[PDB]
Design an enzyme around this catalytic site. Structure first.
Site, PDB file in Angstrom:
ATOM      1  N   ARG A  38       0.811  -1.209   0.000  1.00  0.00           N
ATOM      2  CA  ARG A  38       0.000   0.000   0.000  1.00  0.00           C
ATOM      3  C   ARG A  38       0.849   1.266   0.000  1.00  0.00           C
ATOM      4  O   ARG A  38       0.466   2.275  -0.600  1.00  0.00           O
ATOM      5  CB  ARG A  38      -0.942   0.019   1.199  1.00  0.00           C
ATOM      6  CG  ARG A  38      -2.041   1.058   1.052  1.00  0.00           C
ATOM      7  CD  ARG A  38      -2.775   1.296   2.349  1.00  0.00           C
ATOM      8  NE  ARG A  38      -3.888   2.221   2.156  1.00  0.00           N
ATOM      9  CZ  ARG A  38      -4.445   2.924   3.134  1.00  0.00           C
ATOM     10  NH1 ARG A  38      -3.986   2.804   4.374  1.00  0.00           N
ATOM     11  NH2 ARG A  38      -5.454   3.750   2.877  1.00  0.00           N
ATOM     12  N   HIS A  42       0.460   4.388  -2.610  1.00  0.00           N
ATOM     13  CA  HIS A  42       0.319   5.786  -2.229  1.00  0.00           C
ATOM     14  C   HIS A  42       1.528   6.633  -2.608  1.00  0.00           C
ATOM     15  O   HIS A  42       1.443   7.861  -2.666  1.00  0.00           O
ATOM     16  CB  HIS A  42       0.010   5.911  -0.734  1.00  0.00           C
ATOM     17  CG  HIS A  42      -1.414   5.602  -0.399  1.00  0.00           C
ATOM     18  ND1 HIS A  42      -1.986   5.912   0.818  1.00  0.00           N
ATOM     19  CD2 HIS A  42      -2.402   5.046  -1.141  1.00  0.00           C
ATOM     20  CE1 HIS A  42      -3.260   5.569   0.807  1.00  0.00           C
ATOM     21  NE2 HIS A  42      -3.539   5.039  -0.373  1.00  0.00           N
ATOM     22  N   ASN A  70      -3.573   8.826   4.330  1.00  0.00           N
ATOM     23  CA  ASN A  70      -2.427   8.250   5.030  1.00  0.00           C
ATOM     24  C   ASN A  70      -2.485   8.336   6.550  1.00  0.00           C
ATOM     25  O   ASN A  70      -2.059   7.414   7.246  1.00  0.00           O
ATOM     26  CB  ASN A  70      -1.128   8.915   4.565  1.00  0.00           C
ATOM     27  CG  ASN A  70      -0.751   8.530   3.157  1.00  0.00           C
ATOM     28  OD1 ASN A  70      -0.875   7.371   2.772  1.00  0.00           O
ATOM     29  ND2 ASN A  70      -0.272   9.495   2.385  1.00  0.00           N
ATOM     30  N   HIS A 170      -6.442  -5.698  -2.435  1.00  0.00           N
ATOM     31  CA  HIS A 170      -7.303  -5.915  -1.284  1.00  0.00           C
ATOM     32  C   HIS A 170      -7.590  -7.398  -1.057  1.00  0.00           C
ATOM     33  O   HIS A 170      -8.565  -7.764  -0.394  1.00  0.00           O
ATOM     34  CB  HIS A 170      -8.595  -5.106  -1.448  1.00  0.00           C
ATOM     35  CG  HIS A 170      -8.384  -3.621  -1.365  1.00  0.00           C
ATOM     36  ND1 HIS A 170      -9.348  -2.711  -1.738  1.00  0.00           N
ATOM     37  CD2 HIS A 170      -7.317  -2.900  -0.956  1.00  0.00           C
ATOM     38  CE1 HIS A 170      -8.879  -1.485  -1.563  1.00  0.00           C
ATOM     39  NE2 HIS A 170      -7.652  -1.569  -1.091  1.00  0.00           N
TER      40      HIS A 170
END
Ligand code: HEM
Ligand SMILES: [Ca+2]
Ligand SMILES: [Ca+2]
Length: 306
Positions: A38, A42, A70, A170
């Site tokens: 992740r 990001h 975040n 996910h």
């Protein structure tokens, strides 16, 4: 041009050092593989994969760590510091934090049972962090399918396959109750749960996330195999068991004519999914990178070199 062989002469052991670090950390924190993947996502969605997300606050610019996507969510930063230190020891001033994080994401996916591949390398580190851009560019769980598509296209990923395949991230990891409370009790101010959420699963989730309960409580993204990187995520969608709104919309949105066949294809074949995931991962990893002499090879991923 980014190339998988970038460090084959200057630091051939970089991938192994990264892997070793993650293996060690996974013993005490089984969620770290998911968390690292992740972080790369990001990083790439804000000014490209330039390790901008790893920078801490300075009096001239705010850290992306305080962005809505975040703050009290992104994690694993100390682990990245650890592998960076280990890599710096083996190969001083050679591997950029941007590349390190990319390798970490790939190794995390593989360690979790996903595909194995060599990521393109040669990225360099940013000279600043972009908080406003992060608040604007990172997608949110409450986004509609059109908004999700907009968010991906905004950073350079035009293909629905990019969106559907990368959402496969996910297939493992955790999600806070706060992000699904609306789906469970009052969706879109209807005073009712999200109709696209399986009613049996609805009950289970309500038990894990009661109204007025602990919003920070964590729930598994994939009810089938919570920590294994596989295609089970898509099987869940077909049964209306996607955890967050953005997951289920890939299969149930009125605008999903193009994403539904992809969801089905990935649910039907692990090979089809893994291939698409690698393809999409490398495309995301190619978002506006700094290369050549642009930017730096940051020594401490938390601060720009001085
Ligand atoms: C399509 C839009 C996406 C949205 C709206 C989204 C949203 C979220 C949200 C709400 C969380 C929970 C954070 C928390 O509760 O602290 C999360 C976690 C996570 N996301 Fe996504 N995500 C998206 C795409 C992706 C992509 C492209 C990847 C990577 C390829 C990814 C990988 C992860 C992982 C692995 C976690 C678990 C992290 C952990 O447990 O520490 N996400 N995401
Ligand atoms: Ca970035
Ligand atoms: Ca899984």
């Amino acid at each position: 041009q980014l190339t998988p062989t970038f460090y084959d002469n200057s630091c051939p052991n970089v991938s192994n050092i990264v892997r070793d670090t993650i293996v060690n950390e996974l013993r005490s924190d089984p969620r770290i593989a998911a968390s690292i993947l992740r972080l790369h996502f990001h990083d790439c969605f804000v000014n490209g994969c330039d390790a901008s997300i790893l920078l801490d606050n300075t009096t001239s610019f705010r850290t992306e760590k305080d962005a809505f996507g975040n703050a009290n969510s992104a994690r694993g930063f100390p682990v990245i510091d650890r592998m960076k230190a280990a890599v710096e020891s083996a190969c001083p001033r050679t591997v950029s934090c941007a590349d390190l994080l990319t390798i970490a994401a790939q190794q995390s996916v593989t360690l979790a049972g996903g595909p194995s591949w060599r990521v393109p390398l040669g990225r360099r580190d940013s000279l600043q962090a972009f908080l406003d851009l992060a608040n604007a560019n990172l997608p949110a769980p409450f986004f509609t399918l059109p908004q999700l598509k907009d968010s991906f296209r905004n950073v350079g990923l035009n293909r629905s396959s990019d969106l559907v395949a990368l959402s496969g991230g996910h297939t493992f990891g955790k999600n806070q109750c706060r992000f699904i409370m609306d789906r469970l009790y009052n969706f879109s101010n209807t005073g009712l749960p999200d109709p696209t959420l399986n009613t049996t699963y609805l009950q289970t989730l309500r038990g894990l996330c009661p109204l007025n309960g602990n919003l920070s409580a964590l729930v598994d993204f994939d009810l089938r195999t919570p920590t294994i990187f596989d295609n089970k995520y898509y099987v869940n969608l077909e049964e209306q068991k996607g955890l967050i709104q953005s997951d289920q919309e890939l299969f149930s949105s009125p605008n999903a004519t193009d994403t539904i066949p992809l969801v089905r294809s990935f649910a039907n074949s692990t090979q089809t999914f893994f291939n698409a995931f690698v393809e999409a991962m490398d495309r995301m990893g190619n978002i506006t990178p700094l290369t050549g002499t642009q930017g730096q090879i940051r020594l401490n991923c938390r601060v720009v070199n001085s």
